[PDB]
Write a protein that binds this ligand. Sequence first.
Ligand SMILES: *S(=O)(=O)c1cccc2c(N(C)C)cccc12
Ligand SMILES: [Cl-]
Ligand SMILES: [Cl-]
Ligand code: NA
Lengths: 87, 8
Amino acid sequence: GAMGKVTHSIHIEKADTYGFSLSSVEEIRRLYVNSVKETGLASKKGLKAGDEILEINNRAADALNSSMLKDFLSQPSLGLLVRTYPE
Amino acid sequence: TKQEEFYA
Ligand SMILES: *S(=O)(=O)c1cccc2c(N(C)C)cccc12
Ligand SMILES: [Cl-]
Ligand SMILES: [Cl-]
Ligand code: NA
């Protein structure tokens, strides 16, 4: 594989969790997947650790508050667009 | 610099 950008559109639905952790970072704020629970709902959808979250529920990552972010991760349904790297 | 970690 090479250096072209590949992105992956994911929809997850559910007491239950989605089963991934996500780090908020700056350097340029960014949202990265740290880990994905083996056998969890995000894993069956092909979410991978190190994916970068670009959009959540049709909103750009940059434009997301800790507040929209808390609210989005708590809802029963979750739409993500992620950048995914070759393996 | 890590600001927050969410366990979703
Ligand atoms: S910070 O300078 O420690 C920093 C900057 C960018 C990303 C970071 C990560 N990501 C999970 C890659 C972890 C810890 C610090 C950090
Ligand atoms: Cl390379
Ligand atoms: Cl894990
Ligand atoms: Na590369």
